[PDB]
């Protein structure tokens, strides 16, 4: 029943809440409980459970959650690892000492950026998934960078390329984000799949 | 009625507990577990939104100036009930009321040394509001807590120093020399009197 305009807030504040939770992991939540819950506090009726009961429950639900995000990671650094192990031994393919893998879509011989040198570039990034995260392409626009001021993984490449080239990077995620993840979109231990163009150097 | 089976079931349940008593004591009294309930199922199936996110705003804004008043009277009816209670309490005999307002009656007498302001003491409580309802009890904890005489509400300062280790007394906090309008805590609403049933166990 949402004709109350009290309830068109209640069901607001269990949308919010229940996208909120559902995101940290608490896919096990039964609105069924945290009905009954509110009434027996709206109605100062007796609590089912006391609070010695709700605090252990608490810990074991964030225990939980934790653990998941640890497999989560666990997992998928195995999946990265084994992308790019296959991925290396694909002809066409150079893997550098760094581990960084590159095939050159279009070669040239222009000039090769350096490190105190902030170069023009197009890129769209995307996982081994292939769940695309973020993309000048698809901004429209190019975005001029510096060598020096980004993820390792690009500062290695850029240097390789030439002015006009256009290659496919296949960052590991030691030369990125590693296992820490504030990016939500890209998990933690996710290997970086990037198409770059050297527009030109700025 | 409700499964409460699942380490999740309890913790959910819980979690709608707390809201219950945070949004009451938000001036939030309309809220009915018919939407939220649903709203939980509806998101987490990645179902449509039953409302426009757009009226959904307008609605939350709509009930925050309905709440603020209310959470005025609300907080005005706590503190003259309130009020009224020290004053009848005060006329009760074995109660002696202090130049603070604070009124206290020894349950179990002692002549034990007297705690300073600096000192850490063991005490054995069961706070409670004027309606009974408890909110913080070292007994239903089951364990005593050290806690420092600085540390605590002005309230329990000025007891503490009147009272000696081994003594038992029943405390009538007002809001004054508590929390007071602001409530920090869901359990304590605003401008409400606290009665503690305290005992002295020792001085650290």
């Known amino acids: 029943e949402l004709k109350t305009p009290?309830?068109?807030?209640?069901?607001?504040?269990?949308l919010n809440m229940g996208k909120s939770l559902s995101q940290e992991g608490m896919d096990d939540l039964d609105s069924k409980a945290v009905a009954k819950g509110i009434e027996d506090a709206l109605g100062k009726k007796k609590q089912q459970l006391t609070d010695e009961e709700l605090t252990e429950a608490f810990a074991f639900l964030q225990k939980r959650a934790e653990e998941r995000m640890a497999a989560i990671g666990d997992e998928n650094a195995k999946a990265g690892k084994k992308f790019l192990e296959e991925n290396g031994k694909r002809d066409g393919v150079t893997?550098?000492?760094?581990?960084?893998?590159?095939?050159?879509?279009?070669?040239?011989?222009?000039?090769?950026?350096?490190?105190?040198?902030?170069?023009?570039?197009?890129?769209?990034?995307?996982l081994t998934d292939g769940t695309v995260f973020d993309s000048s392409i698809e901004r429209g626009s190019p975005i001029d960078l510096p060598v020096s001021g980004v993820i390792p993984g690009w500062v290695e490449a850029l240097q390789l390329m030439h002015v006009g080239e256009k290659i496919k990077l296949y960052i590991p995620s030691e030369l990125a984000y590693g296992a820490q993840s504030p990016s939500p979109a890209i998990p933690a231990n996710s290997v970086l799949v990037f198409d770059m163009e050297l527009l030109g150097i700025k």
Not at 6 to 14: D, V
Not at 112 to 118: N, R
């Open 95 to 126: 893997t550098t000492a760094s581990g960084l893998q590159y095939e050159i879509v279009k070669k040239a011989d222009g000039p090769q950026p350096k490190a105190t040198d902030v170069v023009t570039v197009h890129y769209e990034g995307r």
């Open 6 to 14: 009290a309830q068109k807030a209640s069901y607001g504040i269990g």
